[PDB]
Structures are given as structure tokens and as C-alpha cells.
Enzyme design. Structure first.
Site, mmCIF file in Angstrom:
data_model
loop_
_atom_site.group_PDB
_atom_site.id
_atom_site.type_symbol
_atom_site.label_atom_id
_atom_site.label_comp_id
_atom_site.label_asym_id
_atom_site.label_seq_id
_atom_site.Cartn_x
_atom_site.Cartn_y
_atom_site.Cartn_z
ATOM 1 N N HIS A 77 12.289 -7.946 3.871
ATOM 2 C CA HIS A 77 12.876 -6.663 3.410
ATOM 3 C C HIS A 77 14.183 -6.851 2.923
ATOM 4 O O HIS A 77 15.237 -7.414 3.639
ATOM 5 C CB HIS A 77 12.874 -5.690 4.769
ATOM 6 C CG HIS A 77 13.521 -4.333 4.201
ATOM 7 N ND1 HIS A 77 12.479 -3.432 3.756
ATOM 8 C CD2 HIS A 77 14.673 -3.688 4.050
ATOM 9 C CE1 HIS A 77 13.365 -2.409 3.489
ATOM 10 N NE2 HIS A 77 14.701 -2.488 3.569
ATOM 11 N N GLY A 78 14.295 -6.688 1.564
ATOM 12 C CA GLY A 78 15.721 -6.694 0.924
ATOM 13 C C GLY A 78 16.343 -5.312 0.678
ATOM 14 O O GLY A 78 15.766 -4.259 0.561
ATOM 15 N N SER A 79 17.591 -5.388 0.871
ATOM 16 C CA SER A 79 18.503 -4.215 0.403
ATOM 17 C C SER A 79 19.805 -4.845 -0.073
ATOM 18 O O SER A 79 20.535 -6.038 0.571
ATOM 19 C CB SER A 79 18.585 -3.597 1.892
ATOM 20 O OG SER A 79 19.311 -2.238 1.565
ATOM 21 N N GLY A 111 24.752 -0.380 8.450
ATOM 22 C CA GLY A 111 23.868 0.657 8.698
ATOM 23 C C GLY A 111 22.563 0.144 9.219
ATOM 24 O O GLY A 111 21.846 0.663 10.254
ATOM 25 N N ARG A 164 15.010 2.424 8.324
ATOM 26 C CA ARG A 164 14.691 3.586 8.571
ATOM 27 C C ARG A 164 13.913 4.353 7.461
ATOM 28 O O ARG A 164 13.807 3.649 6.471
ATOM 29 C CB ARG A 164 16.202 4.647 8.702
ATOM 30 C CG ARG A 164 16.773 4.822 10.107
ATOM 31 C CD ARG A 164 18.289 4.533 9.555
ATOM 32 N NE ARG A 164 18.621 3.425 8.941
ATOM 33 C CZ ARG A 164 19.551 3.129 7.948
ATOM 34 N NH1 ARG A 164 20.587 4.092 7.879
ATOM 35 N NH2 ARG A 164 19.948 2.067 7.434
ATOM 36 N N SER A 205 10.976 -8.767 -2.526
ATOM 37 C CA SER A 205 12.230 -8.140 -1.737
ATOM 38 C C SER A 205 13.690 -8.622 -2.226
ATOM 39 O O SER A 205 14.512 -7.665 -2.094
ATOM 40 C CB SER A 205 12.003 -8.605 -0.330
ATOM 41 O OG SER A 205 10.830 -8.028 0.257
ATOM 42 N N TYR A 263 15.359 -6.286 -4.361
ATOM 43 C CA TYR A 263 16.003 -5.102 -4.073
ATOM 44 C C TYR A 263 17.581 -5.456 -3.386
ATOM 45 O O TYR A 263 18.146 -4.216 -2.876
ATOM 46 C CB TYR A 263 15.124 -4.411 -2.680
ATOM 47 C CG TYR A 263 14.117 -3.866 -3.653
ATOM 48 C CD1 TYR A 263 14.080 -2.591 -4.190
ATOM 49 C CD2 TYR A 263 12.851 -4.527 -3.643
ATOM 50 C CE1 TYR A 263 13.156 -1.948 -4.672
ATOM 51 C CE2 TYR A 263 11.449 -4.053 -4.191
ATOM 52 C CZ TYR A 263 11.604 -2.734 -4.729
ATOM 53 O OH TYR A 263 10.654 -2.170 -5.417
ATOM 54 N N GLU A 308 2.595 -5.421 -1.004
ATOM 55 C CA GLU A 308 3.598 -4.990 -0.248
ATOM 56 C C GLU A 308 3.033 -4.367 0.926
ATOM 57 O O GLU A 308 1.774 -3.893 0.753
ATOM 58 C CB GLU A 308 4.396 -3.711 -1.113
ATOM 59 C CG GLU A 308 3.680 -2.586 -2.005
ATOM 60 C CD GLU A 308 4.349 -1.921 -2.917
ATOM 61 O OE1 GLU A 308 4.654 -0.861 -2.735
ATOM 62 O OE2 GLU A 308 4.727 -2.572 -3.921
HETATM 63 N N1 3JD Z 1 13.002 -3.418 -0.137
HETATM 64 C C1 3JD Z 1 11.888 -4.321 -0.190
HETATM 65 O O1 3JD Z 1 12.237 -5.259 0.124
HETATM 66 C C2 3JD Z 1 10.910 -3.925 -0.766
HETATM 67 C C3 3JD Z 1 9.441 -4.855 -0.871
HETATM 68 C C4 3JD Z 1 8.152 -4.285 -1.347
HETATM 69 C C5 3JD Z 1 8.195 -3.301 -1.880
HETATM 70 C C6 3JD Z 1 9.366 -2.261 -2.001
HETATM 71 C C7 3JD Z 1 9.159 -1.091 -2.438
HETATM 72 N N2 3JD Z 1 10.548 -0.579 -1.941
HETATM 73 C C8 3JD Z 1 11.080 0.524 -2.374
HETATM 74 C C9 3JD Z 1 12.834 0.810 -2.606
HETATM 75 C C10 3JD Z 1 13.095 1.972 -2.962
HETATM 76 C C11 3JD Z 1 12.408 3.113 -3.201
HETATM 77 C C12 3JD Z 1 12.643 4.353 -3.370
HETATM 78 C C13 3JD Z 1 13.254 4.647 -5.134
HETATM 79 C C14 3JD Z 1 14.815 5.543 -5.163
HETATM 80 C C15 3JD Z 1 14.736 6.583 -4.380
HETATM 81 N N3 3JD Z 1 14.656 6.227 -2.764
HETATM 82 C C16 3JD Z 1 13.844 4.834 -2.507
HETATM 83 C C17 3JD Z 1 10.964 2.891 -3.010
HETATM 84 C C18 3JD Z 1 10.407 1.759 -2.611
HETATM 85 N N4 3JD Z 1 11.418 -1.720 -1.630
HETATM 86 C C19 3JD Z 1 10.469 -2.827 -1.268
#
Ligand code: 3JD
Length: 350
Positions: free
Chosen positions: A202-204, A211, A218, A244, A247, A328
């Protein structure tokens, strides 16, 4: 007193509580820092901004008049002041515009959490500020030794699951941290008996990690727009480190990113090839698996403490009738996740 925390843990605390990074992120979003300083950000205002964006999303799909869309756009910019300078304020009248603003609000929400933690607490002098901010995360953080069997497995997972299509950068593991969020063990315990438990990525953005460590992964709030979520509002994970890692939204300027390894209780997966834009699961399903064209080789899968680690090299899956290049995984209950590791990665851009 001086901090007894290992240097990599101290460097991690400095990185996630970096005020300059919070301000730089707001400048990138073109937020007016005079009308809306970092210290003025509030939970209530972000909550009301999400509600305005949901009204915009509803108005755009309904096919409402340009006057009502202009009014909702104006209300959004009044609530989150922007400094566009030489540009006219972009009208929020399409799906892409609402999604870009919802993405900004997701990041602003975690920036507000980080800044409110940092400015709060007992402002004494008996303890080192790095120790004080460490304790605000309510997370036990330990360094995984580079020579350990644990580190070898994690480095192999990073090396083998880099997708061929994500050739903009190389990944290098700087530090591996073993993490234990307060109360997460007890929360995860009912799901620990569910089958199909996997160690997933999980990337961010780095500015979200104060947070994420204090409150965990969350789900988007109910007030947030329902648009932009391929499989609805849930917690998304990948089995390919680079999917990931994208992201982390790292750049040539700041090539250091943070990525999690979480144990997620998938149980019976609802296997889908296309977008569902729905959060409700069929009876007996505990997660969604979005099927990709490329999957980690199942013969190289290993079981570590009853958890599957899909560290196999990316091979063709057999599905071609899918909109996803890579898998995913989505869970709709925050308690189905147990965060295990936090990796500090170096992105070596081509
Ligand atoms: N964050 C991740 O590591 C990740 C791995 C695989 C699929 C993913 C899909 N997301 C994801 C990231 C953001 C969003 C929305 C798009 C913009 C508005 N709020 C969040 C929907 C999906 N993140 C993923």
C-alpha cells in the site's frame, strides 16, 4: 534527555512530521497560504468541502444548469481558498475536476492530522522532541536488520514484483521498519481466522504517513464523492510493488518514498475484471480482487507465519478480457488490515 531511538527511526519521524513538506504540498495544490495557512486547516472545513464536491458530482451526472454548478464551484473555492495567479478559477463541471479536488482533500485531511498532532500534546522539556512526536504516532517502530531472513524476503518481494510497464524508475530499499499500531492486533484478531491472508503493498504520499500510523488505513468518508473508486470506497492494495509505489507520487526532486506491507484478511475474494463503482459485497465474499493481465508467478509464492507472500516474478495470468494490467485487492472493513512493515524506498528515476 537525548533520544535512545535508532537513527533510522529518528529520520523517519523527521520525514513524516516535516512542516516544510506540508507547506510545499499546499503550494502544489495552489492553495492560498495567506487566506488558508497550515494552522487554519480544520476537520470541519475539509468535511464541508467533501460535501460540496459530492453536490458537484451529483449536479454534473444529473445534468444541472451552469449557474448551479458555478454556485457550487464558488462555494468550494470560498471554503478552500486557491491562489491561481494568472489563471481563471477552473470550473468544477466534470468528473476529472471533482476527482483532482477529492485527491487534494484526501491529502489535506492527513496533513491536518499531522499538523494537529505536532502542535498538540504536553509542551514540556523533560523529553527529546523526536521522542515526543514518536509517541504521538501510538505505533511501536523497530528497525529490521539488513542481514536478517525477514529483510532478504522483503528485498526479493521489491525486486521481483516491479512491473515492466513502470520503467520510469528503479527501486532501492533504504530501511525496513517493523510496525505495530496500538490496538490494531485486538482489532484484527476476529479476521485472523479468515483464510487467504496475504502480505500486500500500500503506497501513499509521505505527508499522509503521520495520519496512517496514528489512525491506520482508512476508508474515504461518506461525505466524499463516490466517483473515482473503481471498486467503491475501500482500502486498496497491490501484489506488485511498483503499482503501489506509483501512489507515493515521488519526483526527481524528492525521490524518497514510504510504502507499507500489510497483512490483509482477504477470505473469499469477489474476482472482477471491470469497475463495479459499488462497495456492497455478495454474501460469503470478504474482499474484491481486480484481475490483472500480469500476476506474480504462483509457484514462487511463500507462506510466512500463515501469511502468503506473492514474491514471484510477474507472469501472464490467462485473463485478457480485463481493464487492469495488474491485480488489486480491496477490503471494505478497516479491521481486515494488520500493518506489518514500513519501507523507506529510494526511487532512482531513469
Ligand atoms: N495505494 C495503493 O497502493 C494502491 C494499490 C492498488 C490499487 C490502488 C487504487 N488506489 C486508489 C487510490 C486513490 C483513489 C481515489 C482517487 C481520487 C479521490 N480519492 C481516492 C482510488 C484508488 N490505490 C491503490
Amino acid at each position: 534527555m537525548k533520544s535512545k531511538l535508532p537513527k533510522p527511526v529518528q529520520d523517519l519521524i523527521k520525514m513524516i512530521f516535516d512542516v516544510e513538506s506540508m507547506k510545499k504540498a499546499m503550494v502544489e495544490y495552489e492553495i492560498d497560504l495567506q487566506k488558508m495557512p497550515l494552522g487554519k486547516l480544520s476537520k470541519r472545513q475539509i468535511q464541508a468541502a467533501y460535501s460540496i464536491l459530492s453536490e458537484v458530482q451529483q449536479a454534473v451526472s444529473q445534468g444541472s444548469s451552469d449557474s448551479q454548478i458555478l454556485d457550487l464551484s464558488n462555494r468550494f473555492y470560498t471554503l478552500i481558498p486557491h491562489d491561481f495567479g494568472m489563471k481563471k478559477p477552473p470550473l468544477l463541471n466534470n468528473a476529472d475536476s471533482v476527482q483532482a479536488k477529492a485527491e487534494m482533500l484526501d491529502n489535506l485531511l492527513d496533513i491536518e492530522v499531522a499538523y494537529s498532532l505536532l502542535r498538540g500534546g504536553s509542551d514540556d522539556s523533560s523529553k527529546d522532541p523526536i521522542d515526543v512526536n514518536y509517541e504521538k504516532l501510538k505505533t511501536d517502530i523497530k528497525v529490521v536488520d539488513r542481514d536478517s531472513e525477514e529483510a532478504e524476503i522483503i528485498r526479493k518481494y521489491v525486486k521481483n514484483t516491479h512491473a515492466t510497464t513502470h520503467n520510469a524508475y528503479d527501486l532501492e530499499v533504504i530501511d525496513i521498519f517493523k510496525i505495530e499500531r496500538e490496538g490494531e492486533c485486538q482489532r484484527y484478531k476476529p479476521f485472523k481466522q479468515l483464510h487467504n491472508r496475504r502480505l500486500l503493498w500500500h503506497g501513499s504520499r509521505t505527508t499522509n504517513f503521520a495520519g496512517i500510523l496514528s489512525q491506520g488505513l482508512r476508508i474515504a468518508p461518506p461525505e466524499a464523492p463516490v466517483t473515482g473508486y473503481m471498486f467503491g470506497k475501500g482500502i486498496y492494495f497491490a501484489d506488485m510493488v511498483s503499482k503501489s509505489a506509483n501512489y507515493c507520487h515521488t519526483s526527481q526532486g524528492d525521490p524518497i518514498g514510504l510504502i507499507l506491507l500489510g497483512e490483509v484478511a482477504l477470505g473469499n475474494m469477489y474476482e472482477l475484471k471491470h469497475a463495479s463503482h459499488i462497495s456492497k459485497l455478495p454474501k460469503g465474499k470478504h474482499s474484491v480482487k481486480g484481475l490483472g493481465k500480469t500476476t506474480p508467478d504462483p509457484s514462487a509464492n511463500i507462506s510466512l507465519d500463515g501469511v502468503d507472500v506473492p514474491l514471484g516474478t510477474g507472469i501472464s495470468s490467462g485473463v485478457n478480457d480485463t481493464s487492469l494490467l495488474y491485480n488489486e485487492y480491496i477490503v471494505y472493513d478497516i479491521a481486515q488490515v494488520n500493518l506489518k512493515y514500513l519501507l523507506k524506498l529510494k526511487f532512482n528515476f531513469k
